[PDB]
């Protein structure tokens, strides 16, 4: 620790006598890191929902992620860097957003009761963010580590494998809804928290931002389930005991 660390701690004010700016720098990254994951999760819902377009089209995109058109025909260690990275901005978010958590018998019991008595939409949707947020502590960790340790096992055949042969569908099914509610609301609540859209009738904006939230995440919940049943079927029809599907190589692997 520094001397201005001791001082700010023993008096509650910076050595130059002002309230630390920290709480602001922190309330910025909680929203900051939160927005990031929010979008990567829509992009990831497309970079991945390409399995509803021939094993070939999908197999294509999985390569380009590996910069085949620069590094040979494929480079898996490059994806481990996107995971290893989007795994860091995963942790950072949790660590800064778990501060906003209920935490001791009272804060919990009181908040709950209130939620139920009130029956307030937006106040109830928070809860959900705070619920799913916990859940992803366990679920999301598995998945993220993998795309960082077996970046080659990702293709139209090898990915289908993991899905049923290693059993991720029990998980991808739960996590599929969490990451889509926590992401959806999170963004709506983020648009009203800083209100970039307010305008000259911020009452009508919060009105559309609230309905738009829905359609946009109702579309991603169906499309997401379609993309789900796809690798599941593709995973069922893999009975040849004489093939490593997990590593169903084509050239620069698979």
């Amino acid at each position: 620790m520094t001397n201005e660390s001791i001082l700010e701690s023993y008096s509650g004010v910076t050595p130059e006598r002002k309230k630390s700016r920290m709480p602001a720098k922190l309330d910025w990254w909680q929203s900051a890191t939160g927005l990031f994951l929010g979008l990567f999760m829509i992009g990831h819902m497309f970079f991945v929902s390409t399995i509803l377009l021939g094993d070939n089209v999908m197999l294509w995109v999985t390569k380009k992620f590996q910069l085949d058109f620069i590094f040979e025909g494929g480079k898996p260690i490059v994806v481990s860097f996107l995971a290893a990275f989007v795994f860091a901005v995963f942790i950072a978010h949790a660590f800064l957003a778990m501060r906003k958590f209920p935490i001791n018998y009272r804060q919990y019991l009181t908040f709950k009761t209130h939620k139920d008595l009130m029956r307030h939409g937006d106040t109830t949707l928070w809860w959900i963010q705070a619920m799913t947020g916990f859940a992803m502590f366990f679920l999301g960790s598995v998945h993220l580590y993998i795309m960082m340790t077996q970046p080659q096992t990702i293709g139209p055949v090898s990915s289908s494998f993991r899905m049923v042969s290693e059993w991720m569908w029990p998980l991808y099914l739960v996590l599929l809804f969490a990451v889509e509610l926590h992401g959806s609301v999170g963004l709506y609540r983020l648009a009203v928290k800083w209100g970039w859209f307010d305008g000259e009738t911020p009452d009508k904006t919060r009105a559309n931002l609230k309905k738009l939230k829905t359609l946009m995440s109702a579309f991603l919940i169906v499309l997401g389930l379609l993309t789900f049943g796809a690798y599941v079927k593709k995973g069922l029809e893999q009975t040849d005991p004489n093939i490593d599907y997990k590593y169903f190589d084509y050239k620069r692997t698979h």
């Binding site: 001397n3 001082l7 023993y10 008096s11 050595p15 006598r17 001791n104």
Partner: protein, 239 residues
């Protein structure tokens, strides 16, 4: 004895809009058997008479003079410079107590307040005739009911409790201790669930994360270690 000493002191006056949290170095030549009570005093009579700090008994039994000496809460009037290796001594006011000025904090009224919180006083139902005789107690009961009435309300086990520094409604070791001091006193007719109503919440005994920092720094050497644990064992099985 004759060696030079470097005294780093904390300073800030919450009521002067122009005061800023800073340090102040003073240079005192050591003397033999020199307790911080002396050092901190010379600094006043001679060097700087702006320094605020509280001393009373100077013997180590009033509990006033408590402060952060080189990172550890302890009694100033009973701390020697000799024991300070290299020679640099930093002084900070006890944390977790309403600051007043530099090294002076309000140890008092928190205790005169926690005392009230735990209802600190014999809870008998009827009085005995002060005229007639006295209540017979095993000489060995009145013995232990002593070692816990010894708490001198100094603040050190509140200043060291990392818990109380974060969550601040905590009762503190010195509080839990008190509660016991009365459980085990015969003249007091309070039951266990009576005590559960005073300290059976996450701000009470339960908020204690057994860091055992209090037990190690108590200038009077009490059994906070086991005692706070004992209390726990009961309050947790209550009702």
């Amino acid at each position: 004895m004759g060696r030079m000493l470097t005294i780093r002191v904390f300073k800030y006056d919450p009521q002067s809009a122009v005061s800023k949290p800073h340090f102040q170095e003073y240079k005192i030549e050591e003397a033999p058997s020199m307790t911080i009570f002396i050092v901190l005093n010379m600094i006043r009579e001679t060097y700087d008479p702006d320094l605020n700090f509280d001393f009373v008994c100077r013997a180590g039994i009033c509990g006033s003079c408590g402060m952060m000496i080189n990172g550890r809460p302890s009694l100033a009037c009973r701390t020697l410079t000799k024991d300070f290796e290299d020679g640099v001594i930093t002084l900070l006011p006890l944390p977790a107590f309403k600051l007043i000025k530099d090294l002076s904090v309000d140890t008092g009224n928190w205790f005169n307040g926690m005392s009230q919180r735990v209802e600190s006083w014999i809870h008998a139902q009827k009085e005995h005739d002060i005229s007639k005789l006295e209540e017979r107690i095993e000489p060995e009961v009145a013995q232990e009911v002593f070692e816990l009435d010894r708490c001198i309300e100094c603040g050190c086990c509140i200043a060291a409790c990392g818990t109380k520094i974060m969550r601040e409604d905590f009762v503190g070791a010195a509080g839990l201790n008190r509660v016991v001091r009365f459980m085990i006193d015969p003249h007091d007719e309070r039951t266990d669930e009576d005590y559960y109503e005073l300290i059976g919440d996450d701000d009470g005994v339960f908020g204690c994360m057994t860091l055992l920092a209090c037990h190690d720094v108590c200038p009077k050497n009490l059994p906070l270690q086991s005692k706070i644990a004992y209390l726990r064992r009961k309050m947790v099985s209550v009702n």
